[PDB]
Amino acid sequence: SSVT
Amino acid sequence: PDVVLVNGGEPPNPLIPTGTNDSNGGRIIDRLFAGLMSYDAVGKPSLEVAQSIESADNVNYRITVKPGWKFTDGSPVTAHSFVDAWNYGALSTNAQLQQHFFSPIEGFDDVAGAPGAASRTTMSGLRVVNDLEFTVRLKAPTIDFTLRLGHSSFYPLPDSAFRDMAAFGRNPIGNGPYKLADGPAGPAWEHNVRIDLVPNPDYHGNRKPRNKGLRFEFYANLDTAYADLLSGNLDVLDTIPPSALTVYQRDLGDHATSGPAAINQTLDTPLRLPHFGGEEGRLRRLALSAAINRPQICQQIFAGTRSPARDFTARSLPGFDPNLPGNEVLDYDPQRARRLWAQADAISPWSGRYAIAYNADAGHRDWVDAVANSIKNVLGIDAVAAPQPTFAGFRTQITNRAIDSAFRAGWRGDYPSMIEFLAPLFTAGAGSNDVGYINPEFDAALAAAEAAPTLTESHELVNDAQRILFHDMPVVPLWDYISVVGWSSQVSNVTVTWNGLPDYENIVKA
């Protein structure tokens, strides 16, 4: 998943 | 409070598993559903909803579903609950960000963006046998197909979802260890503030909660979150702010733990931006990589809690190799950076501003400022930081292509497979390919790595495929993570998993  | 208070953020997208590509939504979705497999804290899968998953060839799979599972609306979990959710994810008409995970299934090309039968709405390779059994036929051997069956893209959905998926995404109904609260003063999901979850009494799987609920608090600022941790107003903080990196050990003692996690950070420059497409753009991306001093930033900005990238994946993954030929593109070399940038200027002279957008809610300010300053000083260009307040808004601009600058990105692993760090980001049609990179030779190299019969061969083929990435520099890999997680004196049994997240179900609160 795309972090942050 | 009796529930465990942990940090999170507003999901950029509704709470639909196949529509969730980010960690803010992901950390919620993974509490609400149970898939065919579940993952332990080291990322090893075990049978969960599946009674069996059988394949002798990595091409043909027979999946049997355990009887007696249900969603929190009382309806049963059946083979259809899986097959209908997977077909929904795969069909291009539904524009699901996780579509890519279905790509190895025969018939994907009919329903996705590919040559094939555009009237078809389901994948021919997915076949229901009976209420609790289905088969999967892949187009080619796929060494991480079994492993990925714990991932959210494969979660089952209740029949009611499909009648109104927008309504479902606002108020999801799942089958997993937690469910949304029916809280005493307003909705469980208070947008931009928090989400409240309580245990699902129906659930009897591998992740039974050891606590009475979870509250994900959507902090606007990680310094606020750290202050709350120190005062006991937050129980678990999975990201220590930069301001605290040199003091957390003094502040928290044995209530903080650190370790490598399968998470990376990149600098993404869409190929559609001025001066950043074609061969010109390739030369400029190589120049940017050479203009960034990853050891220095890791030491000074991050106090040693990031490790300089040596490839496009993460040091802690199986088969990782930090000494691949061609990885010198990830070494700081100002003279080389200027030579590459000048070669790009031979095609078209640079002009304008290079801006790095980021979400300010997650502690990126210091490093982004440092990288922009490094690029400015090495290359002599107008490079600046461009903060945005929230991850949700930032990702929305990236996804809809409104963003008009470079931007930070990075991947938190979904399961421990190097291919999983590459295919979702760099294959031509992937929903999380934020920059528009297309190289069919790379996609073919990954397919070859997937077809290998053994993990050792597969890993060596993945690493061969990464040579193409060293040449193309589709994004600039920066560093991978040393996670630092702190917790309050009111909780215990806090374990940090392989991808840096708390093992939420197992946290205990007296």
Residue numbers in the entry:
A (entry chain B): 3 to 6
B (entry chain A): 32 to 541
Verbatim from the authors:
Herein, we show that heme and hemoglobin utilization converge at the cell surface of Mtb after heme is released from hemoglobin and demonstrate that the substrate-binding protein DppA is required for heme uptake across the inner membrane of Mtb. The components of the Mtb Dpp transporter include DppA (R3666c; substrate-binding protein), DppB/C (R3665c/Rv3664c, integral membrane permease proteins), and DppD (Rv3663c, ATPase). The substrate-binding protein DppA associated with the Dpp transporter binds heme with high affinity.
